[PDB]
Write a structure and sequence with these properties.
part of a larger assembly; 1 chains; 114 residues; alpha/beta; five-stranded mixed beta sheet; 2 helices; 5 strands; 23% helix; RNA-binding; Small ribosomal subunit protein uS11; Ribosomal_uS11_bac-type; Ribosomal_uS11_CS; ribosomal protein; rRNA-binding
Amino acid sequence: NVSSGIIHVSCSPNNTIVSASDPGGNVLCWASSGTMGFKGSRKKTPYSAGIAADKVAKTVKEMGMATVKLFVKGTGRGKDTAIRSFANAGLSITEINEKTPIPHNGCKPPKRPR
RNA sequence: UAUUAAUCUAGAGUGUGGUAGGGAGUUUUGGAAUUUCAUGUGGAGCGGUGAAAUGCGUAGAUAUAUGAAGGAACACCAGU
């Protein structure tokens, strides 16, 4: 029910999530690799993120979606496939930005696995 | 060489001017991020690994935006 908006995607090293939102901060709909049939370790693939982004773009099309900001989050090899999905979808993407939860050198993270 | 009577300034220190440096201690401030809580948005998976599984999830998690709290450590300056 809104033309302008923002859709967020967070490509974790183990999974990915995409979520379309209005500029007021509320969510409209979200999608993830788990929403599709295949599960387990095979869900951390760029193809899975691509189909998730395809589905979220589809389900926001009926909403009447228009020019939209893009905040990409997380690290992984599947985030760019969502970019291809959205660009090829014909949507009115207008701005790209980086919103990884990057911290300054503060709290101590987990260790080296070894 | 040792002892002693002395003398001098290059040895070594003090002064003068200029001069750099994350040198140290004490006393204050800040912001990112995590976590918890609260507020809305939402409905099934999330997390996880070589692959899985304990574990978490409609009693609304993850996510998204805002606010509060507390604690810890100070990317980018950073280097033949």
